[PDB]
Amino acid sequence: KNSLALSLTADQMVSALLDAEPPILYSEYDPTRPFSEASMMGLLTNLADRELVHMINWAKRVPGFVDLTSHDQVHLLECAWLEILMIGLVWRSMEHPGKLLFAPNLLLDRNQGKCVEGMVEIFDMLLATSSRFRMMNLQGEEFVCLKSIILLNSGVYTFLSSTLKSLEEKDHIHRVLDKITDTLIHLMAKAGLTLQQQHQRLAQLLLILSHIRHMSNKGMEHLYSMKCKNVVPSYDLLLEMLDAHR
Amino acid sequence: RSKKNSLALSLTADQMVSALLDAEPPILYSEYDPTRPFSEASMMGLLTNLADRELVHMINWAKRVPGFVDLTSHDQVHLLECAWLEILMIGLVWRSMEHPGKLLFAPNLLLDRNQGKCVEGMVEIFDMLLATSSRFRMMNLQGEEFVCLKSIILLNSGVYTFLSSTLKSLEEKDHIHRVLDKITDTLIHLMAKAGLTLQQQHQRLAQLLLILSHIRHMSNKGMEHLYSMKVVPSYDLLLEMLDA
Numbered sequence A: 001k002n003s004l005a006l007s008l009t010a011d012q013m014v015s016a017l018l019d020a021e022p023p024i025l026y027s028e029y030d031p032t033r034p035f036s037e038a039s040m041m042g043l044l045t046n047l048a049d050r051e052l053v054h055m056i057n058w059a060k061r062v063p064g065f066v067d068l069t070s071h072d073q074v075h076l077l078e079c080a081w082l083e084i085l086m087i088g089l090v091w092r093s094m095e096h097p098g099k100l101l102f103a104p105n106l107l108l109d110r111n112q113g114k115c116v117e118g119m120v121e122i123f124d125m126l127l128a129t130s131s132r133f134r135m136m137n138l139q140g141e142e143f144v145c146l147k148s149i150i151l152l153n154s155g156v157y158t159f160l161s162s163t164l165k166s167l168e169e170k171d172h173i174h175r176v177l178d179k180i181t182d183t184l185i186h187l188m189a190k191a192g193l194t195l196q197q198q199h200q201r202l203a204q205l206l207l208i209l210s211h212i213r214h215m216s217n218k219g220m221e222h223l224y225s226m227k228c229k230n231v232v233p234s235y236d237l238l239l240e241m242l243d244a245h246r
Numbered sequence B: 001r002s003k004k005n006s007l008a009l010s011l012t013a014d015q016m017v018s019a020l021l022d023a024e025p026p027i028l029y030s031e032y033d034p035t036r037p038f039s040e041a042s043m044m045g046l047l048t049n050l051a052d053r054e055l056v057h058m059i060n061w062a063k064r065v066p067g068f069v070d071l072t073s074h075d076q077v078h079l080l081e082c083a084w085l086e087i088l089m090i091g092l093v094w095r096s097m098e099h100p101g102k103l104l105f106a107p108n109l110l111l112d113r114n115q116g117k118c119v120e121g122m123v124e125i126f127d128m129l130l131a132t133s134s135r136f137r138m139m140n141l142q143g144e145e146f147v148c149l150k151s152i153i154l155l156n157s158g159v160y161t162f163l164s165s166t167l168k169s170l171e172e173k174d175h176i177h178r179v180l181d182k183i184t185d186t187l188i189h190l191m192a193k194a195g196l197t198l199q200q201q202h203q204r205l206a207q208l209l210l211i212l213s214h215i216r217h218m219s220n221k222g223m224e225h226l227y228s229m230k231v232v233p234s235y236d237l238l239l240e241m242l243d244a
């Protein structure tokens, strides 16, 4: 692939990723009205709906992503969307121990998780991830690398791949993933970590992604258990949004 | 802030690998000569039976993973509850590597895709497992890398879901993270000795650890299908096997 992505240095990768970051959105409720009146699930659903649109724009700006066919872009987003929302939430919540910062005007604690049956389980997992990032002193530059890894990794092993084209798409993804790895290592070397510390930190970061997958899976199961499914993107919806984007 | 006294942390890379290779469970056989062809119910029976027998050996293996016995029984159980199906699955994928298009559950139970269709929804899981096996094959995964990955799953999968208020709980967690760091070093060591450059080492490490996310996903899907049909070994069972 002549992909410009593969010619990027670590610093250019980080710049591109920092520049692609979506805005922090606000929850939509009247702050003049008391907080009951508001449905918690309604607020969260609405927020996720609005976050999704921005996620598509962000994805299109991840180096290497637009080199893929639309079909593969959709497949990656279908698999990764909730993991991406979740890693964003955890990062925003880092400086708020015991709380989840859904939006600047929607900072929830554990006991607010108990609104909606089974959500507290997810809340606790999210809190623990936020604690882990805090403990590790996760940097914004590392965060954007991890979020891009999720986009590219989560769906890559579930392409139905008979064709030459599909094999080339997979190879491409793996090369970009290798570039993000290099980028992460670079950031750590420049922060003055030893070689051993670099590889240990890389491993600690990537192992957290396993827990993010777990949380996404649990979350998706609770959502599928519902008789309404207002925002969870079908392939076709995602393809439309990708086409509607351009 | 306190660092648990563990012989595990004094092991070199080479000693870690040896200890892990030595702890490997045996390859078990499926219930000998069943009625073939299989029904949906008979296939599930064979797979359930196999998992039950594999579990006992998994506990023995876990007890021999350096650092694992340093933990309290409660924490050992928590790790196994979270990791058990992922461990079965990574074992299966490794055994299946040299059998393209097939899953080697046991030497007398080698199934292909179309045999996955015998139980409703299972082919989806089969396909994910096959794809993982292909990925390991493509990467030329080595047996020494495999044992490191399998131990990482044991230690990592449940580590973030200890409910941890006390200093003691934080020290247990730190211990786990140090052992995980030791296994990372061990993996890097193996790659360096295989003659990979520094860049290649870090890239390969990342490729391997990213597969663990897919293994978590398969475990989750597997558990969901099983709950839809009917499964996590009970705390008490696990405790007994750990005590026994």
Ligand SMILES: CC/C(=C(/c1ccc(/C=C/C(=O)O)cc1)c1ccc2n[nH]cc2c1)c1ccc(F)cc1Cl
Residues within 6 Å of the ligand: A041, A044, A045, A047, A048, A051, A082, A085, A086, A088, A089, A102, A116, A119, A122, A219, A220, A222, A223, A228, A229, A230, A231, A232
């Ligand atoms: C953990 C929080 C959460 C989010 C969520 C995602 C989708 C929907 C609804 C989809 C639909 O009807 O199609 C509802 C809530 C959430 C909503 C904003 C978010 N912004 N950043 C992260 C965020 C997560 C949630 C809550 C309950 C649950 F059973 C499962 C989940 Cl995942």
Ligand SMILES: CC/C(=C(/c1ccc(/C=C/C(=O)O)cc1)c1ccc2n[nH]cc2c1)c1ccc(F)cc1Cl
Residues within 6 Å of the ligand: B047, B048, B050, B051, B054, B085, B088, B089, B091, B092, B105, B122, B125, B126, B222, B223, B225, B226, B230, B231
């Ligand atoms: C994919 C294969 C499979 C395994 C399996 C694991 C546990 C149980 C437990 C049931 C119970 O306790 O009542 C049943 C089946 C399997 C059985 C041996 C195995 N050895 N190595 C890997 C292995 C997997 C399976 C099948 C259908 C499904 F819906 C989900 C799964 Cl996970």
Ligand SMILES: [Cl-]
Residues within 6 Å of the ligand: A025, A026, A050
């Ligand atoms: Cl908005």
